[PDB]
Design a protein around this nucleic acid. Structure first.
Lengths: 72, 72
DNA sequence: TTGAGCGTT
DNA sequence: TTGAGCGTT
């Protein structure tokens, strides 16, 4: 389980931006942003341990609090 | 401003544990835990950028959500 | 605040 | 859910 769900994304948050933000924690291998805009994203890590360490956290991306959960 | 306040600490959270947890983000140079127990701590980073990136986040340490704020 | 497309045990 | 101690512009 190396994919996380990222809730409360804003529309200006691009895949590049999310990847740049999330790769601070470990290698990111994919980002999925729904189209049309649905205010969430999925971020996939190479390492399971990295994804699990983020679950349950609320992180600040460009001043916005996003919630991290397991991807199902 | 390279020091953060860590709110909602639990008593079992030792200085070593907090340092181990927080050094994932960057070099940690000090940890202060009040005695007697007051359910918060201060963590000092070598790098200001690291402290600022954490402010406003809620992080999970041993299953517990702690809130990160600027140290004043 | 839980996604696709290909193409079928 | 905002700390010490040393020792004084």
């Amino acid at each position: 389980g190396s994919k996380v769900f990222v809730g409360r994304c804003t529309e200006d948050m691009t895949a590049e931006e999310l990847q740049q933000f999330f790769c601070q924690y470990g290698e990111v291998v994919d980002v999925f942003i729904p189209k049309p805009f649905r205010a969430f994203a999925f971020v996939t890590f190479a390492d399971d341990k990295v994804a699990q360490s983020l679950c349950g956290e609320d992180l600040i991306i460009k001043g916005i609090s996003v919630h991290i959960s397991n991807a199902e």
